[PDB]
Amino acid sequence: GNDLYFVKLPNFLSVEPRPFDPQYYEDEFEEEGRTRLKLKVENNARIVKWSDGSMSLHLGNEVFDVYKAPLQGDHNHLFIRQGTGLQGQAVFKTKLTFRPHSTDSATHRKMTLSLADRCSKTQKI
Amino acid sequence: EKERFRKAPPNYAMKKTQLLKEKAMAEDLGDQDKAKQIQDQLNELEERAEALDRQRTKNISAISYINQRNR
Amino acid sequence: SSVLHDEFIAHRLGLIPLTSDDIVDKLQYSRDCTCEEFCPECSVEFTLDVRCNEDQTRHVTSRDLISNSPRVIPVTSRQDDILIVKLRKGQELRLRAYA
Amino acid sequence: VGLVKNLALMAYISVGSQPSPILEFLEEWSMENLEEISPAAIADATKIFVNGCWVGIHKDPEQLMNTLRKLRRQMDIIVSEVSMIRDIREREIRIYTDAGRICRPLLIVEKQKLLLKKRHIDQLKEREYNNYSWQDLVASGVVEYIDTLEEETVMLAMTPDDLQEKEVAYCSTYTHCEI
Amino acid sequence: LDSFDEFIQMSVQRIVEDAPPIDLPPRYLLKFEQIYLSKPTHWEDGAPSPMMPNEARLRNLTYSAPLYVDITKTVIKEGEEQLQTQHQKTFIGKIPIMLRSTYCLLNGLTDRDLCELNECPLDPGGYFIINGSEKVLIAQEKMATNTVYVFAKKDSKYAYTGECRSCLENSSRPTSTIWVSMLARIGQRIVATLPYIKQEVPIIIVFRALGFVSDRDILEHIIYDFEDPEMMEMVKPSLDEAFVIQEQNVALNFIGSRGAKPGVTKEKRIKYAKEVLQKEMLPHVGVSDFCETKKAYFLGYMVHRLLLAALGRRELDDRDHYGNKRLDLAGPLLAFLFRGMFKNLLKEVRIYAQKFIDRGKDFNLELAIKTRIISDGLKYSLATGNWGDQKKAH
Amino acid sequence: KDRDSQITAIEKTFEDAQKSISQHYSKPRVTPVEVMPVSQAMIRGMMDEEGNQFVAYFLPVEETLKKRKRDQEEEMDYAPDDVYDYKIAREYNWNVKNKASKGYEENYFFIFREGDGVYYNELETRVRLSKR
Amino acid sequence: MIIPVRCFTCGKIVGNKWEAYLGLLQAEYTEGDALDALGLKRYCCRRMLLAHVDLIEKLLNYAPLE
Ligand SMILES: [Zn+2]
Ligand SMILES: [Zn+2]
């Protein structure tokens, strides 16, 4: 009920802070556009634990592969600060002595146009 | 005409055609062309990878197995 | 059409041992035979014809060396075979050889 | 003879990066900026050197070096290719982010023990079968690229064990180990 | 690969977009901005396709990308008629690609694909194909920029010379090798070899021209501790040796009186000596309108450090020491070129704008853009090995 | 592109991690064992100082000096700057409040085993404690 | 490129033993027992199989056709 459940993810894996709800979700977004749509059709979560002590984070058939590496610059307490009480009622939980090291990736594309043009014009007469 | 009908990928031409397919996908601002390209690309990839594993099915396959277990 | 040279094939063919006991004390040395080319009295003729048609790679072995004499064969009688080349899908090798 | 040379196996040459987040960061410590300084306050204060540029003055150089290295391990504000050199005898901190600096990876030492614990070897032995790699040793702060000009200041061991045992003392202040 | 990648991503751009807008009777603007590079091609008189490195090798071709830029033809005339017509993706030249780089066709590419391209999976990369020749750029070593050194050229009027190869960041201005040195011998005088000045000048006269009228005020920059008379009595000989010049203006006269082109009128001279002390000397510190206060600090640092070496308080610098060296890899080697090659084309478009406005007609940049500057300069230097222009190749 | 594709694939992946797990890219080398399901305000701490706002280096079993954390905002112009401490008497304690260090704050989403439920509790603003 | 037909030193045929040797490394053998099980007594002949690098496997990837 309390354990290491903090999960950093990169920009391209930004999961919604709230459950999926049909009343909260809208169509705004569209190789170029391929990376665009992925932001909300994927990104509720199930961090699967494995016999080697690795973890895999799943938001589909696509996989983020994860290790519970230690942390020393970020020694905070994690807490559910909901606006209710005096000025955000932070409920106590786990301390940030570790955070995920993990792999989530992208790609590029190719192009081609033309070099120079014709020349050697001549006026009448 | 002569580029149209005969089976295109084997042996080397599939690599340049795969690149060309990628370029066709990337040059399109239209999502339909992109997705059609993506589909096409995946299919040719699969076909090609099958063909590669098929050729390597024998006597290449055998050496692959010893190298993975030796390291 | 193999991945090796021309002389690589020929060199490797040279080093394959041939069953000699019954025949070698009968033959003329080549330089001593009256024939204008080669004779069964001064040589044994060999033949390799291999085409990889299938998908898998082809182990060109001493099995492929077909002799005209039944006794002067490569060592196959009674344990794998001397690998000559490996062929891919569409590559081939035709040669005739004399011992 | 001796003019044409060869790289070492693990030599890496700095590809270069802008000194601008460093400038932005160094600003918001207890620095003092060069143009708003009284000429009488340079005597007992260490001189800061970004890419050859004397950009600032600092009254406490033991807080900077410990802070700059922590970032240079944690892969965030200071990129791995940067070298930070502390001159003790003269009150100078020199930082280079520029390109063309030859450097090589070393294991980090703390107390007199390596940061390369058996966890890293276990994750790194199981690479390919999982996504882990050399860059995770960098990002975990286990190994560090050290420039020739920063190698001037390391107290370097040559094997993990043999140099970090307990005898009559050689140094007992090792900072790094050879790979 | 990394060197190259940084050149393609972050030095091709930033050499384009560094150059000044050209003008010329009404006059124009003519500004460059975004740059575009494609995968390599050969038939962009055949049908367009990617060139593969192995075809480039077999046909004695040059493995290169076409290169394009966004140009605004911006112009204004009488009547406040103005326009900013943009030529998106104007061709500039062809740039040779390093094998297995971020912009090669052979990038992130599997063993299966490499074999299908008839190319080696073991091939490291890092070389150019130039007329079907594999070329490598050998990493040329050099003394590190922006870093003060001290040496004893005893074979001269100088007992010690302090040095700085001051440079800004890949600027159209090259490095200025400043020297600040101590004469042998009153005795004990100290001089700046400032750039483009005919001869070296005593360091105190530099700080006077910088704008420091007071004596007290110059030495606070060069001597940090006023409490050790050790360093006080060391600068006296030079401080005595500048008592005739007290204001900024007479000071300027003194440097301006020694430019390569000394101005006939006095104000010409001052206009010179103000310019060299703001753009020429110590660029890395700043080239702005007012940077004297920080140029002052760094020069006092060089004098300070020479005084430290001379007092014997600090050990002389070793020129052989590899920390005092840097390596021109395939990035910086190319950036050095591309600067000059881009300058050449701005000289072309210049004369081409001129020949065309003078007729009172209108001028067209598509014909002005000489493709053969880049495409051939690159291809040339990477071919001969001569790191320069073809006409000054010796 | 289209909305129906998105609602389908999202609500489907709120089930495609809840199926049976038995093969993977890293099979046969490994097989899966078990599952950890998924505003906020985290008071960062300095590793040197070792901050008293939440006692991570000692892990207290009960508050020796308070009933609960009365951690309101440090000012009316300062709602994200919470008091970040476990105090309930008006006593002059030393516990460090959350300062507006946004500069370094950066990103940090938090989640929990909410009874094996689909939710999220991502962090709002990574504020930091100090020796004040 | 491809396993020699004979041990260069002595002249024993090793050309037939390479497939078999890799087959004995599909089994869990040390190379020392693989070499022994094939009957290579001399330290000449034993070098041929230890030291042979099989490059014909890589040259075979460069298809001519299909
Ligand atoms: Zn005969
Ligand atoms: Zn032998």
UniProtKB/Swiss-Prot annotation, chain A:
Subcellular location: Nucleus
Tissue: Highly expressed in skeletal muscle and heart. Weakly expressed in placenta and liver.
Source organism superkingdom: Eukaryota
Subunit organization: Component of the PAF1 complex, which consists of CDC73, PAF1, LEO1, CTR9, RTF1 and SKIC8. The PAF1 complex interacts with PHF5A. Interacts with TCEA1, SUPT5H and CTNNB1. Interacts with SETD5.
Family: Belongs to the LEO1 family.
Function: Component of the PAF1 complex (PAF1C) which has multiple functions during transcription by RNA polymerase II and is implicated in regulation of development and maintenance of embryonic stem cell pluripotency. PAF1C associates with RNA polymerase II through interaction with POLR2A CTD non-phosphorylated and 'Ser-2'- and 'Ser-5'-phosphorylated forms and is involved in transcriptional elongation, acting both independently and synergistically with TCEA1 and in cooperation with the DSIF complex and HTATSF1. PAF1C is required for transcription of Hox and Wnt target genes.
Protein name: RNA polymerase-associated protein LEO1
Gene, per the UniProt record: LEO1
Curated annotation (Swiss-Prot), chain B:
Subcellular localization: Nucleus, Nucleoplasm
Stretches assigned to coiled coil: 29-63
Lineage: superkingdom: Eukaryota
Summary of the function given for this chain in its UniProt record: Component of the PAF1 complex (PAF1C) which has multiple functions during transcription by RNA polymerase II and is implicated in regulation of development and maintenance of embryonic stem cell pluripotency. PAF1C associates with RNA polymerase II through interaction with POLR2A CTD non-phosphorylated and 'Ser-2'- and 'Ser-5'-phosphorylated forms and is involved in transcriptional elongation, acting both independently and synergistically with TCEA1 and in cooperation with the DSIF complex and HTATSF1. PAF1C is required for transcription of Hox and Wnt target genes.
Subunit structure of this chain's protein: Component of the PAF1 complex, which consists of CDC73, PAF1, LEO1, CTR9, RTF1 and SKIC8; the association of RTF1 appears to be less stable than that of other subunits. At least in HeLa cells a N-terminal shorter form of RTF1 is also found in the complex. The PAF1 complex interacts with PHF5A.
Domain notes: The Plus3 domain mediates single-stranded DNA-binding.
The name this protein goes by in its record: RNA polymerase-associated protein RTF1 homolog
Annotated source species: Homo sapiens
Gene giving rise to this polypeptide: RTF1
UniProtKB/Swiss-Prot annotation, chain F:
Signal peptide range in chain numbering: none
Family: Belongs to the PAF1 family.
Region spans: Interaction with PINT87aa: 1-97
Quaternary structure note: Component of the PAF1 complex, which consists of CDC73, PAF1, LEO1, CTR9, RTF1 and SKIC8. The PAF1 complex interacts with PHF5A. Interacts with POLR2A, TCEA1, SKIC3, KMT2A/MLL1, SUPT5H, RNF20 and RNF40. Interacts with UBE2E1. Interacts with PINT87aa which is encoded by the circular form of the long non-coding RNA LINC-PINT; the interaction enhances the binding of the PAF1 complex to target gene promoters and may anchor the complex on target gene promoters, sequentially pausing RNA polymerase II-induced mRNA elongation. (Microbial infection) Interacts with influenza A strain H3N2 NS1 protein; the interaction interferes with host cell gene transcription, specifically with that of antiviral genes.
Domain of life where this protein originates: Eukaryota
Function description: Component of the PAF1 complex (PAF1C) which has multiple functions during transcription by RNA polymerase II and is implicated in regulation of development and maintenance of embryonic stem cell pluripotency. PAF1C associates with RNA polymerase II through interaction with POLR2A CTD non-phosphorylated and 'Ser-2'- and 'Ser-5'-phosphorylated forms and is involved in transcriptional elongation, acting both independently and synergistically with TCEA1 and in cooperation with the DSIF complex and HTATSF1. PAF1C is required for transcription of Hox and Wnt target genes.
Entry's localization field: Nucleus
Protein name, as recorded: RNA polymerase II-associated factor 1 homolog
Disulfide bridge map: none
